[PDB]
Write a protein that binds this DNA or RNA. Sequence first.
RNA 1: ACCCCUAUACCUUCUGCAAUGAAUUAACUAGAAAUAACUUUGCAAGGAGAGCCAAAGCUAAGACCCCCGAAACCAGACGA
RNA 2: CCGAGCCUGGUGAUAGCUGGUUGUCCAAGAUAGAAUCUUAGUUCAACUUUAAAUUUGCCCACAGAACCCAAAUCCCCUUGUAAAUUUAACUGUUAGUCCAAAGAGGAACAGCUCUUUGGACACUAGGAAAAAACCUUGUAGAGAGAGUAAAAAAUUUAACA
RNA 3: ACCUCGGAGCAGAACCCAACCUCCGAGCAGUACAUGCUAAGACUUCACCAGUCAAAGCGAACCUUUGAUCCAAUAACUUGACCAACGGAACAAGUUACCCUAGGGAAAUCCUAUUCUAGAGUCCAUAUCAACAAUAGGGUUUACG
Lengths: 52, 51, 108, 324, 115, 95, 100
Amino acid sequence: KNILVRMVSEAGTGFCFNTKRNRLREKLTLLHYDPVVKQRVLFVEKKKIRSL
Amino acid sequence: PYMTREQERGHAAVRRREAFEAIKAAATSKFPPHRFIADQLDHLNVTKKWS
Amino acid sequence: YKTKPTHGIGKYKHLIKAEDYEYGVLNIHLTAYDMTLAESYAQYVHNLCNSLSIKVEESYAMPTKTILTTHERVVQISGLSATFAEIFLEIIQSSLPEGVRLSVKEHT
Amino acid sequence: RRTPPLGPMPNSDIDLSNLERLEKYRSFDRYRRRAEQEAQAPHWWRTYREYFGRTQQLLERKQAIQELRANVEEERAARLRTASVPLDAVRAEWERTCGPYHKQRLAEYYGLYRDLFHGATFVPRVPLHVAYAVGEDDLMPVYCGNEVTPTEAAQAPEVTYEAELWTLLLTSLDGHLLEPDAEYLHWLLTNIPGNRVAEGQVTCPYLPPFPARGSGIHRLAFLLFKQDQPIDFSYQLAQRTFRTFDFYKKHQETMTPAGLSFFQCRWDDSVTYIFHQLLDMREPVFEFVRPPPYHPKQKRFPHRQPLRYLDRYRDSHEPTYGIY
Amino acid sequence: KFTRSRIPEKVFQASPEDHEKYGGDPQNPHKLHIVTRIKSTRRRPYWEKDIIKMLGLEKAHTPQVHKNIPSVNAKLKVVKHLIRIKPLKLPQGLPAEENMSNTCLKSTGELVVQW
Amino acid sequence: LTYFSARKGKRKTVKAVIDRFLRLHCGLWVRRKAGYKKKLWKKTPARKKRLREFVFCNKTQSKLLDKMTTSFWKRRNWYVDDPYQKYHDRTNLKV
Amino acid sequence: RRQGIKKMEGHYVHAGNIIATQRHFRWHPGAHVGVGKNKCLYALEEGIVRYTKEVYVPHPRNTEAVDLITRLPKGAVLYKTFVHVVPAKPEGTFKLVAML
RNA sequence: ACCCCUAUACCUUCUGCAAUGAAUUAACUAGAAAUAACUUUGCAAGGAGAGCCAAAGCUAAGACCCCCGAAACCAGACGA
RNA sequence: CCGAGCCUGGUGAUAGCUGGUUGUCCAAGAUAGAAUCUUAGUUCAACUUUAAAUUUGCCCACAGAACCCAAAUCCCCUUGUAAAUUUAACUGUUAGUCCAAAGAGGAACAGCUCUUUGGACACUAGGAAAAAACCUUGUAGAGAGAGUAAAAAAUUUAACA
RNA sequence: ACCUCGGAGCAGAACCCAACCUCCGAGCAGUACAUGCUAAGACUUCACCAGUCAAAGCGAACCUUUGAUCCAAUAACUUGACCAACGGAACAAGUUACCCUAGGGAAAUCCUAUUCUAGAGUCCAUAUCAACAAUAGGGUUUACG
Ligand SMILES: [Mg+2]
Ligand SMILES: [Mg+2]
Ligand SMILES: [Mg+2]
Ligand SMILES: [Mg+2]
Ligand SMILES: [Mg+2]
Ligand SMILES: [Mg+2]
Ligand SMILES: [Mg+2]
Ligand SMILES: [Mg+2]
Ligand SMILES: [Mg+2]
Ligand SMILES: [Mg+2]
Ligand SMILES: [Mg+2]
Ligand SMILES: [Mg+2]
């Protein structure tokens, strides 16, 4: 199944956004727009929010 | 028919507009009626007697 | 709209067909020593067919057989008139380049 | 119920049972060409258009083409896709041959005919040339629809045309400031002897173009009329205003248009100079004002509307306090 | 379902036999209808009831004069089974202001300026 | 609601209304959209934008809320930096 | 579903008004008519709504429509119903703001 | 007076006639109120006899929210 | 008068259920969707009433509304008309009956269960025998005047070259 | 068995509707991580709640099937189970003939007799009986797992 995860910005900001990834799939690292920084920055998966 | 559909177009428009103007005037002229000191004071006559 | 004179102005499926002595299905089998020669003759006969307005269905090939190898080709043909079949076959006969085997065999 | 079609239904003439025997659109482009043809063709149904609407010369041409083909160098360059074409020679040849027709198309597109002669057209037979001398070393030309600044058009232009009398006129079809239909004449030479222009009768002196700021782009037309016999004719706007329509009505018996060349003028500092120095008046400034945005009639209860609904109808953004 | 009835136009195309029968000339047609309601609007559709009210035929057997023009005629066609239509005939022409108060609608359909 | 309280004899306010709706003085009631904080990960950006909005109530909804609150909640409040100060009054309204 | 035409021919329409809601492409966008993600037709300008029949030339990237059009006889032309908005007001006017 | 002609009791509940209630008389026997509104006064950017409301409002008055009936439940007594 | 005594009190228990709800006169006044531990109720909508503001409202001639592959409906210039919309306030009715018509409930003629269009009944009178639903007809009183509307069932047959 | 939603029948031509009913699938999957932010004007499952589309603008790049409130958790942004009886009581089943109260109410598929004569009837129809059908008369059943 899929799990909702909290991608947390690697830019030092507290900005986090939620994505969906397969449980069997590896932890996610993804480029995403940082509104506070106003630039695309890397985000890393921190913790599993739920299992959907 | 006496007139055709093209001939009749607009031949009564002025009268229809005036009639609706009258209807609108009646609708917008609604207001409470006047009140008269004579009407208020005439009620004193309920105790009019013969001296 | 149904009641309007322009009803059905947008219909198209009637223009798409998705599915007097005349022949049936005709198979022309071309066995040849040369891939290039067989392919060229198949192209030539296909061009003759589609220039003479012949319904050509398939242009496939048989699997190769080894006992050197001989390449096989098939041309499918449907729709022939009395004189049209004669002229078509005689043109094929006079246009066979070199050492190729024709056929007028049928299906199955 | 079914009302019969009011004409030939499309795809009815070819509607036949021999679909397999009917040649088909093997390609998209052939269908596109057919569809464009059909769209151009008139129809009995409602359509988008309804609402939004010598022999020796031939022989010489054939021989010249044969010579060019025979030239092996030309074939080698063409097959190597490296050949080129003399633009100046092609320009001159086109001007002589079919340039007047293209210039008539340009005039019709720019609305010169409809705005000057109320739709009456003609063909600019004379390949006129006008150019405003910029500085001293060069001169900006005035083609059919060019773009020239009033700074470059400050002084009168040099006119050349291979012909033999002539009346040359300049109008601003849309520069008028009071009456929409009228236009301003800028300079008019009459009874031009042949080609030389300095000897022309200067009835109205030369005026540079003066398109007001933010008033858009104005189209200025050089008209040239063939003249049979001279006729006596006749810095103030009331006397510079006139209509080419009735003007040429008064002279069409002996004058016939044979040349046109027009250009677009925008605002420039020279326009400030024109308005102040010699017109002696405050220059007008125009702004393109769009209509106010449409809003539906305000409701007492704007159900399901966002809070911005009230802002859509308030006029002043500053806080107000009423009686307080 | 019961719906409005679209009367085919051939119904309202008079024949020469009709012209002889009823005495109206298709050329120079009559200007005004006299319409009287002769049938109840009860048990009739609401649209017929509405047309009767619009035409002012609420009272039966009370003549009402209307224009002989296509729109009025369309309404009359909607309610033609409830009414009697007769042309208004003016043997002495339309009444003048002097005799506007001395007119009478004869049962034949003639507005006479003497009464 | 309580039309006459047992201790004062007064009409009471339904506090569920106060916890949920804002009353603009002119008579308009503002609210949030239901579900505006629920499962945002499965909602489209347009739907989320619609849900994040402050929304007016019906005439009948407003009448119900007016009945369910007392006159205290319908007074002029001159808060210091009220974001709704401009919205407290209607302008250019015809009937 | 409550789908269908919301603005019939001749109806005045303001920019943004939905003209017709549809599941398929029963009506196609004409002049000044945009399409939503769900094939809804909305007005891009303020004006009068007109319905016409026009020759249909599908976008080349539309593979299915291109195949349909290539399988078509040499004289046939496809037609579709299009919705246009005939703009009423001009884009704007030039007004005298200052006599410098 | 009757004879003539016309005339399918009342209430309530049913979609509508069947069903409900009524021997009859007298007496008794059942629409209680706020949020707003509206109307009429007063005063008016203020009204109100503290408090409250006010971007024409405020104050006052006028108008509007029935009767009978369970099986029950609990508490405390009284009863072999 | 015990599947749980009796009395008093809480208690004017509660009752979406039943019954009742008292002067005169006039006027406007009709079937209708959604949700609901909901279908014996209620709330919103629709309708309805009052007051108010304003300007258009209804009818509709063309034009217009899809391919797949019928009757009609929508929309609105005229026109006939006088209403409609909005504002304020508000109760009550609303999971009906019958008739005409078109359909679905398995490719179910009738019966039923529903959907849709229209009419009627819950509102007067005349007629059809009596008569809620068929026909005629409605706006109100008095008359010892008059013209009409609907309104009356039909039918009686077997020789034979 | 179903209860919510979506697609098709099922409505021939705006919408709405044949509820009940028939079939199918969804409580998503894939993709992207501007698949952002804002904002005119509109649609709408006949209320509301909710649900859709969207110009212009700003910013990056250069989409195709559901569930409210409260309450919890999270610094917050946000997230969660139950509500599937899917407008959702936070947590409650069987049973009463021992019961009480308040009320409401009470075409096809079968048979009989004639008709056509199929035919039985010793052969022979019409002495007698009689098939399928038709005619009448009587009774039963229904659209619903
Ligand atoms: Mg009794
Ligand atoms: Mg004892
Ligand atoms: Mg005892
Ligand atoms: Mg009680
Ligand atoms: Mg009445
Ligand atoms: Mg519930
Ligand atoms: Mg109940
Ligand atoms: Mg469906
Ligand atoms: Mg809606
Ligand atoms: Mg439930
Ligand atoms: Mg539910
Ligand atoms: Mg026992």
